[PDB]
C-alpha cells in the first residue's frame, strides 16, 4: 500500500489534492468534499482527520473503532469557515466554540469578534439564546 498522503497533516493533504490530483482548473468545494470522503474511507482512509492544533499530539487510539469517536471530536474553525463559504447549511454553534482554538472554555475574544464578522456577512442563523 503505497500511501503518498502519509506523514502529512490535514491541511497539506487537502492542498496536495487541489494541485496534483485535481486539474489546474477546479473549484474549492469539490476538493474539500473529496478530501473529506478520503478520511471517511471508501479502500483505505489515506487522508488525515481535521484536528484542532492542540489535540494533535495524542490522536485518539482508533482501536478497531474510529468512527464512534470522530462523532464527538471537534474540528478547527477553518474547515467550517470553508464550508460556510461554500453553502448555508451548517451549525454556526459548533463553529463558534471556545475550545476549538484554545483548550480552556473561558477565553471568548476571538469567538465574539468572529460572530461580529459573521453578522456583518449577512449570516445570522444563530439563535437568540446563544447570542445572548
Amino acid at each position: 500500500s503505497i500511501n503518498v498522503c502519509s506523514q502529512l497533516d490535514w491541511k497539506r493533504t487537502l492542498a496536495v489534492h487541489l494541485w496534483y490530483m485535481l486539474p489546474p482548473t477546479a473549484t474549492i468545494a469539490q476538493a474539500l468534499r473529496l478530501y473529506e470522503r478520503a478520511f471517511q474511507e471508501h479502500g483505505e482512509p489515506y487522508a488525515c482527520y481535521p484536528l484542532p492544533p492542540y489535540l494533535e499530539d495524542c490522536s485518539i487510539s482508533l482501536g478497531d473503532e474510529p468512527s464512534a469517536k470522530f462523532s464527538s471530536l471537534q474540528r478547527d474553525v477553518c474547515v467550517h469557515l470553508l464550508k460556510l463559504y461554500s453553502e448555508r447549511q451548517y451549525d454556526l454553534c459548533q463553529l463558534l466554540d471556545p475550545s476549538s482554538v484554545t483548550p480552556d472554555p473561558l477565553d471568548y475574544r476571538l469567538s465574539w469578534h468572529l460572530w461580529m464578522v459573521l453578522q456583518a456577512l449577512n449570516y445570522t442563523h444563530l439563535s437568540e439564546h446563544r447570542q445572548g
Binding site: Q94, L96, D97, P105
Partner: peptide
C-alpha cells in the same frame, strides 16, 4: 460546571 456553546455541560 459551565454550559458550552453546543449545549453540553462541562466541569471547569
Amino acid at each position: 460546571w459551565k454550559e458550552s456553546v453546543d449545549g453540553q455541560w462541562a466541569c471547569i
